[PDB]
């Protein structure tokens, strides 16, 4: 999925049951790779510390 | 151009290995070596520039995970290294009771597994 | 009363109305104007036509499938051969110019995707050998739209220029173009994307033939998908209106 | 100084700060306040490393060359370009144009050759490093005459002395410089295509004053480029692939970034 | 880089209720998710990235 | 003709610098320019859109 | 400008969206707060923890089907395994809290349907035998909604619960609720339904495991209804956050 | 300025200054002059060295490697810990936490290997000190790309030159320096336990820039730390017994002092 | 902007310094900070205990 834009889509649809999980990560953006070639990513792996609040926006 | 660069995680595939003449533009294929896993995203091909060197090379290839230890009875597993190919664990015994000592993640086949079997203590 | 979802755009003899819009993207924060008299190096006096070069100009159209990558366009070389704006720019030597970009999509409230709406200012493209530079005809499509490739090209002794969608052709990461003014066409939210863009260069005027300062990507990052029963042409259009557009050197006209 | 967090309470009203549409493309100015209850911490942090100075002004090696003092290769050359190397190319390909002064330093380190000539007693080796800017008479061999060095500039440095450094202004006949262009050299859109077209910073070249001793002596020139004075426009995303080519931006296409188990895995 | 005294926490998401589709609709959608940096972010240690790579001077 | 500023200290004492030559392209580097405006990549919208009321209304 | 069918509620670390939502009821015209000194009377000092406590709790989900006769929950039972606020009215011998219900059900506008949703204090039930009376399991579901009969439970020897939809367990009128602070989910006006309820008994405090002072109701008056080929599963929601809540007499946890 | 002291004389009273209770664990605050007759001499004695910079302000050696122009070992590697010495440890550990600026000096010395190689004329050797954050590309051979130094610090020092020195500030996370650490890295008290997991200060390496000699050579780079605008909280007392390890406290049991020959004795 | 100040002599004659550096961590050490407060690691108890009174009474 890394070889197209199908990594970049979340795929939820209707099942017949309640309360599934849709995704989950770590916060890492320094070093998961979900958050690693982000522009946060890429500005976060020049450096050594961070800190701060982090936004996350569903579409 | 040379010889291909060397690299840790992946080997030349044949027969590439023997052979000793490439012109400019000529495209080798590499091989993840054992255990090694294959990475989807990176490719595994260099191409002799015409300056007469080759294309730039990253580890194409990632070491295999060995299978979770699991959790020894009246026993505490210290994991130093991860469970990576190549590491290994230790296996120690509580207060009040008496246990092989240690573990190691080795290829066996075509995956990795851990050598030892959990002891008894 | 007001709603924000109605807009209206009026230059020279043209005029686009919206019914379903977001917001307009300003380009930087800048509006387009003028070159002044303090940051100005040509000595003759331009040319300001100012009615006919500012209106608004419909390239075709494109059919946007379940399996579309994606599709390019090179502003100064999309209006080349279009009306006044192409036969100023063909006489004269330098010219400098603001571009408003219109994408437009129509659909239902069952149809279902969603487009990026970028403008990328200096995209350089590489080429599928790695070895040679891409050919003009590849880089550069005109009357006509140039798209993607999802698969990567192959390398050969071959002056193809590299369509991965993924990598937009210049190697980075289609997901951090946003840096660049964009919007996104959600087909349950907006019909049309309107972005405003500046002149932006590091020269005060230059020639806009052998140059091309920006380009606009559209790109599908959802697929479209319907059910059977349902309009299954769905196509898309670009509007681009040129701003404040100002000529110098008036020479023999160039083909 | 970074922007203190505000101490909030419960909330029942009609003001949905959380709820926005990004198809306009304006990023959501929310802080956490806004979608849970805060404490109010004065914030004493900084973002005084974050600046474009202190971002790209640091020293990186651009280019390094060897030349002898004997055999065919006597002097080295070398055209200016910083496309050379890697680290340095992609902290300045963050922003389309870049204006910035050049601190330039040279490190020149020598070494005694294999060969078989006994007897052998040096003596302190002197380098010249000579600037041609183009248009001007390039040496054709290590005893030419353009080496008078008269309107051009040139360095003279003795080995185990400190290494040489100089500062060079901003020097672009444009108004900034051009980490990318989109053209072509001829007006007919054909011949050089990319950034190649818009380079023009001349050459370089070093040479031994004097042969030293009877014996072979390879020397090593090494090029190291400190940015001071930055101003930069427009930011672009960072190289996700591997660089090919120095005057091209040509690639091999590439993964956005690096496979996991499945969508549910906390773990790389 | 990765440390686990600098532990982050897991992100998470699950379906609430199930997804309502009206008859000649798609039932299978994609979410998309965006991450931004807030005002309060900060990084304090010039270093070099890792994935930057080189085995000789280009050209 | 010398200058005096304060240096980089922790929160929660100057220092003095002159110039020695006549170019302005040889002096030190600009370290302790702290201004920020995020406004033209953040926010480039052309209508204001306030926080707490609906984006598309 | 502003619409009045969006509206957040944020408690301790969480918050709750609504884009189509009716007003919001209040109790009987009063707010939850806490004890006044005038008005206690036992006399340690109480805990407020205040964050943990008063945040929103999400319980199970219910399929609701095209025959489903209803469901309800005792609030003092529902939280009294979940979270800080299981502990903490465990350990104390006294407890006071208003709860606040947001009840949520998600469809499509080819769906049909009407619930309502109703909070009655102090909802006495009957059993199936005259004599004798209901067991607490039967009464009682923790981690889970009991439900309603479509037709009247036999009476044998039993301590089984009379499940009557018409006579809503008490023996009255299910349209008379409506005396109840409540509201209705119409599945073409509105998503989802907010009662805010104070403290009421008739003492100033209360042990929270013997005595459950208000009861949820949540009862389909109109069937779910739709054609074949749209969404067969449609459940619903109730998350319940305490509001102001105190306790009083620390002493052994009770299981 | 020491207390001077005040001048007594012949006391019949009821205040008891010498008894006390020491269950409280209050220090008794007696001077000479409570017990005794006193004169009134002025005091100008100062404890100026007694305070923590004057204590900890000196530079001392905390490790020392050695690498070579030919061979295997071509470069040297060195993860930042000031647990490595004996003198500076045990110096350091007098107190809980403590917050220092850091003044880093390097001594560099070669010496020539003994060989078979004939005309043997060395050139100055030139060497390269790069210090690598945690989480960076860690050089994996000598002739690595990582040795650009774009974002990195780098020193580079030519033999017979004064050593390099540089300032380091404050580097921590946390609120200050721990000495001592009570816990485990992971949050069920498994893993690794002690002050090893508060430690990540990165790695430092070292390379000769040129071989200089067609004969074997030898370099030793030694690390000198000198604490400087130090701050300290929490004392506890010195160790008695001797170091063994340096990513843990563990020991040998050891006596509190050493014998003499009867309670009665005025020698060791 | 010097700073003048009294250098360590004996008992019973000024220097001046200047920062070069804009990192107030590249500054000399502060060896004259003679300044002490031993009272909360000697009687750090509660109540107050003067000495001529009995400890316990
Ligand atoms: C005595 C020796 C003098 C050497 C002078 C060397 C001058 C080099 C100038 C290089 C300027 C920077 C080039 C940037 C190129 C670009 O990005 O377009
Ligand atoms: C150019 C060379 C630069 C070298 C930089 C070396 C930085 C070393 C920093 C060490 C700080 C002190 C570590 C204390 C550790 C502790 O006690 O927890």
């Known amino acids: 999925k890394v070889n197209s834009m199908e990594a970049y889509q979340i795929p939820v649809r209707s099942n017949e049951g309640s309360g599934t999980q849709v995704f989950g990560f770590p916060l890492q953006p320094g070093y998961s790779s979900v958050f690693s070639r982000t522009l946060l990513g890429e500005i976060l792996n020049y450096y050594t510390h961070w800190s701060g609040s982090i936004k996350l926006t569903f579409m | 151009c040379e010889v291909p660069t060397r690299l840790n ?113 | 009363g007001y709603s924000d979802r109605v807009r209206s755009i009026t230059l ?10 977001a917001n307009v993207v300003v380009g930087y924060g800048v509006w387009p104007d003028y070159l002044k008299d303090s940051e100005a190096t040509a000595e003759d006096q331009p040319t300001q036509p100012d009615v006919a070069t500012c209106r608004f100009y419909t390239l075709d159209s494109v059919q946007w499938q379940k399996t579309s990558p994606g599709w390019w366009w090179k502003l100064p070389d999309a209006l080349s051969n279009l009306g006044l704006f192409g036969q100023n720019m063909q006489y004269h030597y330098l010219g400098r110019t603001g571009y408003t970009i219109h994408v437009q999509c129509n659909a239902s409230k069952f149809h279902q995707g969603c487009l990026l709406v970028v403008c990328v200012p200096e995209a350089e493209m590489g080429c599928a050998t790695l070895d040679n530079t891409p050919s003009s005809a590849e880089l550069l499509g005109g009357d006509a739209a140039k798209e993607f490739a999802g698969e990567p090209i192959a390398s050969g002794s071959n002056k193809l220029v590299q369509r991965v969608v993924y990598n937009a052709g210049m190697g980075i990461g289609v997901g951090n173009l946003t840096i660049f003014p964009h919007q996104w066409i959600n087909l349950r939210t907006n019909n049309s994307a309107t972005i405003v863009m500046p002149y932006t260069n590091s020269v005060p005027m230059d020639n806009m033939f052998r140059h091309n300062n920006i380009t606009l990507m559209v790109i599908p990052f959802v697929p479209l998908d319907y059910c059977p029963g349902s309009t299954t042409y769905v196509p898309i259009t670009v509007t681009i209106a040129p701003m404040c557009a100002e000529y110098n050197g008036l020479r023999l006209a160039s083909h | 100084r970074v922007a203190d967090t505000v101490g909030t309470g419960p909330t029942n009203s009609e003001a949905i700060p959380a709820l926005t549409a990004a198809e306009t493309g304006h990023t959501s100015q929310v802080v956490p306040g806004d979608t849970m209850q805060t404490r ?135 108004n900034a410089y051009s980490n990318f262009y989109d053209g072509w050299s001829e007006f007919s859109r054909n011949g050089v295509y990319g950034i190649n077209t818009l380079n023009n910073m001349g050459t370089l070249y070093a040479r031994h004053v004097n042969t030293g001793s009877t014996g072979p002596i390879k020397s090593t020139i090494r090029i190291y480029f400190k940015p001071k004075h930055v101003k930069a426009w427009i930011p672009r995303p960072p190289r996700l692939c591997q660089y090919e080519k120095a005057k091209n931006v040509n690639f091999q296409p590439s993964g956005v970034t690096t496979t996991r188990q499945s969508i549910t895995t906390m773990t790389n | 880089a990765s440390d686990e005294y600098t532990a982050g926490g897991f992100i998470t998401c699950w379906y609430q209720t199930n997804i309502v589709v009206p008859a000649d609709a798609q039932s299978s959608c994609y979410i998309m998710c965006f991450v931004s940096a807030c005002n309060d972010f900060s990084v304090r240690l010039l270093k070099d990235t890792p994935f930057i790579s080189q085995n000789s001077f280009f050209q | ?45 052309k209508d204001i859109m306030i926080k707490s009321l609906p984006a598309l209304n």
């Not at chain 2, 030349?12 to 490439?22: D, M, R, S």
């Not at chain 4, 144009?97 to 060969?115: A, C, G, H, K």
């Not at chain 6, 220092?15 to 370290?31: G, P, Q, V």
């Open chain 3, 12 to 21: 020279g003899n043209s005029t686009i109305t919206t019914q379903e819009c």
């Open chain 2, 9 to 121: 995680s992946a080997s030349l595939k044949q027969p590439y290995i023997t052979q000793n003449y490439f012109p400019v533009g000529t495209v080798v294929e590499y091989e993840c070596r054992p255990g090694y896993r294959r990475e989807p995203s990176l490719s595994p091909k260099l191409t002799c520039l015409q300056n007469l060197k080759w294309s730039t090379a990253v580890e194409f290839c990632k070491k295999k995970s060995c299978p979770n230890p699991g959790e020894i009875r009246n026993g505490q597993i210290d994991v130093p290294g991860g469970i990576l190919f190549g590491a290994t664990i230790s296996f120690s015994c509580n207060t009040g009771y008496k246990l092989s000592t240690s573990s190691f993640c080795l290829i066996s086949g075509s995956s990795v597994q851990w050598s030892d079997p959990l002891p008894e203590c």
């Open chain 6, 1 to 45: 003709g010398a200058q005096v500023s304060t240096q980089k200290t922790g929160a929660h004492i100057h220092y003095t610098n002159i110039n020695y030559y006549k170019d302005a392209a040889s002096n030190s580097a600009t370290r302790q320019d702290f201004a920020q405006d995020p406004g033209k990549f953040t926010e480039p919208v």
């Open chain 4, 40 to 174: 109010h911490v004065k914030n004493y942090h900084s973002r005084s490393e974050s600046t474009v100075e202190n971002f790209l002004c640091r020293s990186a090696c651009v280019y390094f060359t060897e030349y002898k003092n004997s055999g065919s290769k006597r002097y080295a050359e070398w055209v200016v370009t910083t496309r050379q190397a890697a680290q340095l190319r992609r902290k300045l390909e963050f922003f389309t144009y870049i204006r910035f002064d050049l601190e330039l330093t040279f490190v020149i380190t020598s070494t005694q050759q294999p060969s078989t000539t006994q007897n052998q007693d040096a003596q302190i080796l002197t380098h010249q490093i000579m600037y041609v800017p183009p248009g001007g008479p390039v040496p054709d061999k290590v005893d030419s005459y353009v080496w008078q060095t008269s309107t051009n500039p040139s360095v003279f440095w003795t080995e185990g002395n400190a290494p040489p450094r100089m500062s060079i202004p901003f020097l672009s006949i444009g």
